[PDB]
Amino acid sequence: LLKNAVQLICYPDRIGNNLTDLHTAVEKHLSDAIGGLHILPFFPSNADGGFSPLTHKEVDPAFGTWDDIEAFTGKYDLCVDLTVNHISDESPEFRDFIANGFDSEYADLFVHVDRFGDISPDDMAKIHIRKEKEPFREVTLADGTKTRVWCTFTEQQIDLNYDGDLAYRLMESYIGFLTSKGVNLLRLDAFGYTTKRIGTSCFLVEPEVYRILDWINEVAFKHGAECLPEVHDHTSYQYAISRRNMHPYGFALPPLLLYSLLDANSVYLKNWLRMCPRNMVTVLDTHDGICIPDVEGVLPDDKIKVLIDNIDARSADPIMRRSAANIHSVGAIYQLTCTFYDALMQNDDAYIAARAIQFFTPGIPQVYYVGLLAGCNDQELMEKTGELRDINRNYYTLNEMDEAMEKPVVQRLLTLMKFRTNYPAFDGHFELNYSNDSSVAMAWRHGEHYCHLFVDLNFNTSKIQYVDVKSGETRDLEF
Amino acid sequence: LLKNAVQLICYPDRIGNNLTDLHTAVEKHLSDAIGGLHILPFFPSNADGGFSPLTHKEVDPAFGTWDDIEAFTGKYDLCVDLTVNHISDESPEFRDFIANGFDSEYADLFVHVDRFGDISPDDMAKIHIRKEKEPFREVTLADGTKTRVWCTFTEQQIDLNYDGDLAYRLMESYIGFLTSKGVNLLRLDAFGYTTKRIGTSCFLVEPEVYRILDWINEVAFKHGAECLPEVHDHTSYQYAISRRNMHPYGFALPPLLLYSLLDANSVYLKNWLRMCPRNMVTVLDTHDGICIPDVEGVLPDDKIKVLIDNIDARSADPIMRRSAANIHSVGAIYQLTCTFYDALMQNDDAYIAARAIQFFTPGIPQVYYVGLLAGCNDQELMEKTGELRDINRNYYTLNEMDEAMEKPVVQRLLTLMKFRTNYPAFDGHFELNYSNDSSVAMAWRHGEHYCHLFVDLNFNTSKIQYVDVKSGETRDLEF
Amino acid sequence: LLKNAVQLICYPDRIGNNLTDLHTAVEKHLSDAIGGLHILPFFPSNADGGFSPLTHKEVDPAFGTWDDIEAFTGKYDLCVDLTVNHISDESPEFRDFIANGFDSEYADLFVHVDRFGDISPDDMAKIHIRKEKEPFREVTLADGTKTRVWCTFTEQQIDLNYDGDLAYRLMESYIGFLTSKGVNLLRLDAFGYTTKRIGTSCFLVEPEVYRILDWINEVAFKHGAECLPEVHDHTSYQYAISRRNMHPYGFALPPLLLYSLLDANSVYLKNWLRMCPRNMVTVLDTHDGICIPDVEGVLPDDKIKVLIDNIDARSADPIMRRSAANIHSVGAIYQLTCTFYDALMQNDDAYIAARAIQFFTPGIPQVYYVGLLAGCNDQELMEKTGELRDINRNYYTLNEMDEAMEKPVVQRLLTLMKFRTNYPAFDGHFELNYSNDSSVAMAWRHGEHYCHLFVDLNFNTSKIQYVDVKSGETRDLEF
Ligand SMILES: OC[C@H]1O[C@H](O)[C@H](O)[C@@H](O)[C@@H]1O
Ligand SMILES: OC[C@H]1O[C@H](O)[C@H](O)[C@@H](O)[C@@H]1O
Ligand SMILES: OC[C@H]1O[C@H](O)[C@H](O)[C@@H](O)[C@@H]1O
């Protein structure tokens, strides 16, 4: 069972140089403000910012050791990535397949493209892939033979075969290892791609996807962990996840709030809050950029268009959906690339009000480390590395974090975070209040404990009242 | 706990002449096809087709007696209306208020408009009322005094005061009486208007509305009934109801299905099924006509406009929202007035596929008696009475129902109903299957029982495969 | 080679009672105004107004004999339908299949659906058929066996198998017989359906459709006939036909002209005229109603919507494309149902200007008999028969035709027809003239012969000047 407290999303090495510096900054600044951490992939990896792991059972020496990861458990919940879709081509299992071909004992762990026969143009066209190449990578075996394996992402990421047994055995092995290190929340990355079936989109193929998901959830349960399955697609999948006793993502909230604040409109936000899925992990910013498919239906299309044009006229290029020529179309944008503080135009009041609304939304709130420090678009890093998403992946030295922690806007955010992590009304029931169409009123009640948020979207004001239980007096949070 | 079986929606006197003839038709035709019945208001009433009851403790003698109603219980579940918002001005309670004024012991039962003081123009414009008159009725007391009471609907309907204690006692008295006659599901009419507060819309004012609803729900539970609170507004209210251990309505489905079949599009339909409110009572047609606010957000606005223009170009006038000049707007239409069979253009395959999708949707399916008999738009009835909704409130003699029962499409619908009412797979868990964007695939599993629906929206084909328990083998259902 | 003169489109029995009365009216009124005739199907038929022929080798006695048909040849070109897609289920060939099953010597003549195996939902959905049923009919053999044959249209129309040899042998027999009765122009009905291949749309499947089409063209030529292949789809198919020495239809013209006259716009008309296909047969009205797919690209979508809404707002219901819910969409309308005189609002000047533009368009112009007589929408017939297309299939007695011929608008149309049929400039080359955006100027030159049409679309004026070569002087045509 997880703590109902704010979580930090952070890299192993973007705050100081490593996991030790990370722990130093966390105890120095956040020890009363968070109850958990999502540490992004810290295993050996050769692509995609950690998500091409050679194994889930080892720490990259550049980051530290397993003792450095266990330095967090015992005081904080620990959320760690489980890359269910693929592993690195430098993993022992895949190098063995390169070395021994189909005589390898790990041969059935990978998807062999030629075992599907001819795939028709129609069936190629259905496949849900955001890259403009076929998801097939041709490799050279040790004996000079060439064979093709399924490859959704970059070529160093070779997809796992959930028609075989080896994939499930591999994942069960990772989970047992991760939970024995104190991981109690498993983020299931890109789970929607685990179902390959020609004739389908090969993405979230149901009911097959929920059987994979129930199996992982059951394995996690017997090992003391819960699951955070990650999908960027229609909101409905978030309810499917929730209804199967797993934690979905509140991916709808960031673009919904951005629109709500920017246009002084509370209509869609309140409708979403009244129906939002149970047991969410909520985010405003992530390590990825603001995802558009997650808010379809939650926000009318014309209002998503407003948000898209508003952001893209002011920040870096979005990430496009595949073969989508219409840059003003909802259906064409996958993610806007913009820090959340810059999406709100560095407006301190708007940003704190966004965080308050996040924190009064049902579910466990995650704060991304860049948003924690009110970071701006990192143009210089993006130009240094060539990775668009680095515009939202700032590095900070420990001194730079000390300095950022002194900003008025960050001190207001710390006060909120402490309140959300500690005040007991959040452990009770959510109760939305009536407001006009340009403001939001949100409350939590648990016995005598009670707190109330009012946000005016016109003027970006945030007011929290709460009951100090020893007396009956209502107090103001001062944030 | 209700039977997980098909229910019939019917008037007390539109199948034959009374409740005795209703029971005759039900035992002759439907005793293997339904497990429950929603008999529309049959009390003494002076407005709006039963929904202005003088009391809930009497049967209008024109319909029969309480024994005619208890003849249905014991074999059938019984869903009955509770008009929580208002009672008749000819009720014993309101006639005492006319006779004795504010010395009446029932003074707190009604809302006294002048006790609000002056209502600003702004605050009048907020009020959620679909009629273009102020919701205030001036009545003359016996002593010649004039005083005004709140009046949402027709003038013979006087709203109840949930700021007083009398309103809760009145409802609790009705519930006790209704449950002692075998009512085990209470449809809570127009409950959203029970919260009056100036400065608000006076409709679904939260959290007050859910306190009213939790209270009635508990009274019903300890008297052996569950609740079906009815709201025609945004889908989110259906989920709010659902998480409070009450049955919401599937009002989203009818216009969603109509669009899905007419435009051969399953995208929005499948997204809705994946996220559906829990424990809902599903409908296609009702006694009121296809309501549009209920599918907002569920379907994009341009597709709702498509549905609106398609039906309005060939059917009777819609019911508008209050001061809405744009007849081509979602925001301007309240209900389409059209029988469901005419909405699907009297296409037997399409109508049967729609019913099959309804029956495989999670929740209790209700079949409206006009839709049961595949009835068409009743132009003559609407012309005789002047009531638009009578275009969907056909009368049948007992002879005419016998005749309609023999239609091939009605016999096909009977087979569906028998299957949905009896086959045990629906008592297990729902399982959506992958399909393309012009067809739907839906399944139910409960142990060894299993049934699978495939509907192709292009050609309106319906196919159900299921496991024959007697043999074990998979069979095709002949409907 | 055909005469470059006006042709009449007519039924066998809609002018008087039969083919004898047809010849009477033609020799009485039209002997200097037309040089050819398209007589719509006059064979034994049991569906679709003649288009389900039991055989092409005999005349239905209700219409007359072959001598009544040969009474027209020798003075007029003779255009007759060849229903290449299907023959009647009461044909000797299909009745032999019912009696003898797959032992029938004609078994290979029809398409047997079960020889395709399972057809996926995707491959069913690709199929181009304008009806909301699967195009499969289950028939009972004489021995009680049930088997299914392909069926695009009504069930009495059984499609022919162009994967077999019998279909070509049958068609070659039909062409040989028709040409021996004097048919020198063969209308090839619905040829686009002759290619059935699962995985494709089963409509205009290239390159095979042109191979079927080259073959018919070659058989027709060696029997003394040319071909008029009939397809309603994108105009590009009209050019594909034209490049294969066949006559395409000018289906683009009717909706293009209507828009041009109704909105006083010549832009799209002139662009089409400058690039229009080469050997076409031009029409304004046909026996079917104004077909929309033929004008896509030729007219912008927004201007097609204008035409659709303008006509549908004041005449009978359109014929829809399959499962198309948006009644204001181009993609949803197949044909408007309105006589061409009513589509122009019975405006005599506008109508005569339309015919002059038709006649000055390159190609052989056909005049439909209802348009000949300036006929209005025949609602009484449509209500009597229940067929929508009958609003455009008026019956006239010989006397009613005598009266219609005396109407001033028809007398002007006669002068045009005589002029277009006889003046030699039409045997030369077309030359478009510069005009503003609300008028059209068209000329024909052949040596010393020259004629020029000016139409003002604002005021519906039409002027023709022509050279009397015997005298040299320019004269005005008084029509
Ligand atoms: O390749 C896997 C992808 O999905 C993961 O869940 C991460 O969120 C993303 O950063 C990564 O690119
Ligand atoms: O006036 C009350 C209204 O709400 C009721 O619940 C019924 O659905 C409707 O027929 C009635 O008119
Ligand atoms: O079924 C054949 C169809 O195409 C034919 O060519 C005719 O033009 C049309 O009237 C008929 O309905």
Q: Which residue has the tokens 């049959």?
A: B42
CA distance A6 to A423: 12
3-state helix, strand, coil in chain C (%, to 5): 40, 20, 40
Alpha carbon distances (Å) from B448 to B362, B468, B476: 19, 9, 16
- Closest to B374 in 3D by CA, of B319, B334, B414, B316: B414
The DSSP symbol for B438 reads T
Are B389 and B331 contacting, i.e. CB atoms less than 8 angstroms apart? no
Are C295 and C256 contacting, i.e. CB atoms less than 8 angstroms apart? yes
The residue of chain A with its CA nearest to that of B207 is A433
- Cis peptide upstream of residue A207 (ω within 30 degrees of 0): yes
The residue of chain C with its CA nearest to that of A199 is C122
Q: What is the B309 CA–ligand 3 centroid distance (Å)?
A: 30
Dihedral of alpha carbons A296, A300, A301, A303, sign: negative
- Closest to B203 in 3D by CA, of B152, B266, B274, B163: B152
Helix and strand numbers (H, E) in chain A are 16, 19
CA distance C462 to C439: 10
Q: Which residue has the tokens 């129902």?
A: B401
Using a 10 angstrom Cβ sphere, with 0-12 exposed, 13-18 middle and 19 or more buried, the burial of residue C75 is: middle
Helices C408-422 & C348-360 angle (0-180, nearest 10): 10
Contact call for A433 and B236, based on CB within 8 A: no
Distance to chain C for A230, nearest Cα, Å: 29
CA distance A26 to B210: 41
CA distance C54 to B319: 52
Contact call for A434 and B297, based on CB within 8 A: no
Alpha carbon distances (Å) from B103 to A387, B54, B98, B100, B141: 79, 21, 10, 6, 11
Contact call for A432 and B239, based on CB within 8 A: no
Residues near A391 by beta carbon (within 8 Å), at least 6 away in sequence: A315, A316, A337, A338, A339, A377, A378, A379, A381, A382
Residues in B closer than 8 angstroms to A266, CB to CB, are: none
CA distance B98 to B453: 58
Alpha helices in B345-423 (DSSP H): 348-360, 369-372, 379-385, 398-405, 408-422
B89, B189, B294, B390: which one is catalytic?
B189
**Termini Cα distance of chain B:** 29
Is the distance from the beta carbon of residue A189 to the nearest atom of ligand 1 less than 6 Å?
A: yes
Resolution (A): 2.5
Are B103 and B96 contacting, i.e. CB atoms less than 8 angstroms apart? no
Using a 10 angstrom Cβ sphere, with 0-12 exposed, 13-18 middle and 19 or more buried, the burial of residue C21 is: buried
Other Cβ atoms less than 10 A from the Cβ of B6: the count is 26
**CB interface of B with C, residues 142-181, below 8 Å:** none
State whether residue C184 is helix, strand or coil: coil
Alpha carbon distances (Å) from B73 to A235, B20, B77, B281: 41, 14, 6, 19
**Torsions phi, psi for A319 (to 5 deg):** -90, 125
Task: Output the six-digit token pair for C355.
Answer: 């015919």
Q: How far is CA A138 from the centre of its chain?
A: 31
Which residues of A carry out catalysis?
189, 230
For atom 12 of ligand 1, the residue with the nearest CA is A48
Solved using? X-ray
**Torsions phi, psi for C140 (to 5 deg):** -100, 120
- Cis peptide upstream of residue B53 (ω within 30 degrees of 0): no
CA distance B179 to B80: 10
Distance to chain C for B350, nearest Cα, Å: 9
For atom 5 of ligand 1, the residue with the nearest CA is A189
Are C416 and C424 contacting, i.e. CB atoms less than 8 angstroms apart? no
Residues in C closer than 8 angstroms to B267, CB to CB, are: none
Are C473 and C300 contacting, i.e. CB atoms less than 8 angstroms apart? no
Q: What is the C51 CA–ligand 3 centroid distance (Å)?
A: 6
Other Cβ atoms less than 10 A from the Cβ of A99: the count is 12
- The string of DSSP letters for A221-244 reads HHTT-EEEE---S-THHHHHHHTT
Which residue among A201, A236, A271 places its CB closest to the CB of B234?
A271
Is the distance from the beta carbon of residue A48 to the nearest atom of ligand 1 less than 6 Å?
A: yes
**CB interface of B with A, residues 411-440, below 8 Å:** 431-434
Residues near B376 by beta carbon (within 8 Å), at least 6 away in sequence: B339, B341, B342, B346
Are C298 and C250 contacting, i.e. CB atoms less than 8 angstroms apart? no
CA distance C152 to C85: 9
The DSSP symbol for A162 reads T
Helices C19-29 & C398-406 angle (0-180, nearest 10): 20
Which residue among B263, B350, B459 places its CB closest to the CB of C134?
B459
Q: Which residue has the tokens 């010989």?
A: C398
CA distance A128 to B249: 34
Q: Which residue has the tokens 């997650």?
A: A294
For atom 7 of ligand 1, the residue with the nearest CA is A189
Contact call for B263 and C326, based on CB within 8 A: yes
Is the distance from the beta carbon of residue C51 to the nearest atom of ligand 3 less than 6 Å?
A: yes
Strand partners, C15: C396
C68, C77, C189, C294: which one is catalytic?
C189
Q: Which residue has the tokens 């704010």?
A: A6
CA distance C42 to B207: 76
Q: How far is CA B429 from the centre of its chain?
A: 25
Ranges assigned E (strand) in B40-176:
77-82, 86-88, 136-140, 146-150, 157-159
Contact call for C125 and B458, based on CB within 8 A: yes
CA distance C98 to A247: 62
The DSSP symbol for A184 reads -
Chain A neighbours, 3+ Cβ pairs < 8 A: B, C
Strand partners, A463: A454
- Closest to A130 in 3D by CA, of A299, A297, A302, A335: A335
CA distance C150 to C167: 14
Looking at chain B, the residues that come just before a C–N gap of over 2.5 A are: none
Q: What is the C190 CA–ligand 3 centroid distance (Å)?
A: 7
Strand partners, B248: none
Residue from A51, A81, A85, A392 to probe ligand 1 pocket by mutation (most atoms less than 8 Å from CB): A51
> CB-based contact (8 Å) between A197 and chain C?
no
3-class secondary structure for B439-466?
EEEEEEEECCEEEEEEEECCCCEEEEEE
